[PDB]
Amino acid sequence: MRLLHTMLRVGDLQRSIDFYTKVLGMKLLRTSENPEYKYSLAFVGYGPETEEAVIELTYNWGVDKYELGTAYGHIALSVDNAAEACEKIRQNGGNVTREAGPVKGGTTVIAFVEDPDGYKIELIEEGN
């Protein structure tokens, strides 16, 4: 068994695709529409769904906002360069909630940011 994906509802599909791919470096793997139930999907990721976990973005026609709640935490991604991502993210209008820097008591560089819908993302700069 394997973990396939994490699905998040977004208020604007393209805005989200633009962010994940252009700002975070993922690729748009596939997209679909469901006319019957009025929603669209997009899968974004760093590699093929067959080999690894990705993100499923769901856009319900006409719905631009959701209630985030207090349960869901975040998604953590390995980042090539934390500082730069924060910069890209910021200048790209986003919010950096935790500037890049070594984590408390450790050495690993991490940062926290928010996507366009306010979801939190943890960036961690990390057989063979």
Locate breaks in the chain with C to N over 2.5 A; list the residue preceding each: 126
Annotated active-site residue 122? The verdict is yes
Radius of gyration of the chain (CA): 15
Q: How far is the CB of 64 from Ni ion (least distance, A)?
A: 21
> Cα 77 to the chain's mean position, in Å?
8
Q: Residues 49, 114, 122, 125: which is the catalytic one?
A: 122
Nearest Cα to 57, choosing from 91, 3, 85, 17? 17
Positions in the binding site for its own copies (CB under 8 A): 1-9, 24-26, 45-47, 50-56, 58, 66-80, 117-119, 122, 124, 127
**Bridge partners for 123 per DSSP:** 77, 111
**Interactions with Ni ion, residue window 38-77 (CB under 5 A):** 56, 76
Question: Using CB distances below 5 to 8 A depending on partner kind, what does residue 115 bind out of Ni ion, its own copies, none?
Answer: none
Q: How far is the CB of 15 from its own copies (least distance, A)?
A: 15
**Binding site for substrate: what residues are annotated?**
9, 60, 74
Q: How far is the CB of 14 from its own copies (least distance, A)?
A: 18
Amino acid occupying residue 48: P
Lay out the site mask for Ni ion across 103-122 (x = CB under 5 A, - = otherwise).
-------------------x
Q: How far apart are CA 114 and CA 128, in angstroms?
A: 32
Here the tokens at position 86 are 């924060």
The 8-class DSSP code of residue 15 comes to: H
Residues making contact with Ni ion (CB under 5 A): 7, 56, 76, 122
Residues annotated as part of the active site: 122
